[PDB]
Design an enzyme around this catalytic site. Structure first.
Site, short mmCIF file in Angstrom:
data_model
loop_
_atom_site.label_atom_id
_atom_site.label_comp_id
_atom_site.label_asym_id
_atom_site.label_seq_id
_atom_site.Cartn_x
_atom_site.Cartn_y
_atom_site.Cartn_z
CB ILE B 83 0.60 -57.00 9.32
CG1 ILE B 83 0.94 -55.54 9.65
CG2 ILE B 83 1.15 -57.93 10.39
CD1 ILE B 83 0.58 -55.14 11.06
CB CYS B 84 3.51 -54.36 5.07
SG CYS B 84 4.94 -53.39 4.54
CG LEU B 85 4.28 -52.63 11.80
CD1 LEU B 85 3.54 -51.41 11.28
CD2 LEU B 85 3.53 -53.26 12.96
#
Ligand SMILES: [Zn+2]
Ligand SMILES: [Zn+2]
Lengths: 63, 145
Positions: B83-85
């Site tokens: 996940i891109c966070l």
């Protein structure tokens, strides 16, 4: 109201009650052993640090 | 096992995040099994999404590691569940907790941001990408518990 207060004097790093609390000008404080503000990221001069004896007394008169 | 983790864990089980089940692994307390309900009015609604979260050695100085286990059609979740966070990288702070991560991932489901091939579909034709996400949810994120 007592839980909210205890959470106000909780060190956001160790998650225990503040021990020798050192405060930043932004109003956030940490245990002396636990140290940009880790919480709000507002920068501070590494000497604008000041102990908060009042909070220390509130911590004691809590538990 | 630092007391910080014990406190967070104790606190997480006491006051759970709404729409999020998060429990420590029975064998390894650094591992958490996470289930996030699909947010209402989202393409992921009705779905239950499984995630694995673990706390590396340097936590809380280092961010927790998170990966989606359940297949999901989301612009910010790749084929490997990564996940891109920002708070999982350069925006991580020791003042942040597992709660904040869980809350952020939950919010990411409500607000997919395409601005990878999945992101392309959400961009060129959004209405269809939502429909695919809705199908993927039915296929992989329902009755999957
Ligand atoms: Zn502390
Ligand atoms: Zn601050």
């Amino acid at each position: 109201i007592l839980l909210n207060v205890k959470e106000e004097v909780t060190c956001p790093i160790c998650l225990e009650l503040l021990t020798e609390p050192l405060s930043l000008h932004c109003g956030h404080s940490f245990c002396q052993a636990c140290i940009s503000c880790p919480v709000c990221r507002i920068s501070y001069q590494p000497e604008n640090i000041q102990p908060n004896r009042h909070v220390a007394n509130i911590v004691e008169k809590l538990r | 096992l630092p007391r910080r983790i014990i406190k967070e864990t104790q606190r997480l089980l006491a006051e759970p995040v709404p729409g999020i089940k998060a429990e420590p692994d029975e064998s390894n307390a650094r591992y958490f099994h996470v289930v996030i309900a699909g947010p209402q009015d989202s393409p992921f609604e009705g779905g239950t999404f499984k995630l694995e979260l673990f706390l590396p050695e340097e936590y809380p100085m280092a961010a927790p590691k998170v990966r989606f286990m359940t297949k999901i059609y989301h612009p910010n979740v790749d084929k490997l569940g990564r996940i891109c966070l920002d708070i999982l990288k350069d925006k991580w702070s020791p003042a942040l907790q597992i709660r904040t991560v869980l809350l952020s991932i939950q919010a990411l489901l409500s607000a997919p941001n395409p601005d990878n091939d999945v992101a392309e579909q959400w961009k060129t034709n959004e209405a269809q990408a939502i429909e695919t996400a809705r199908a993927w949810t039915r296929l992989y994120a329902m009755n999957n518990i």
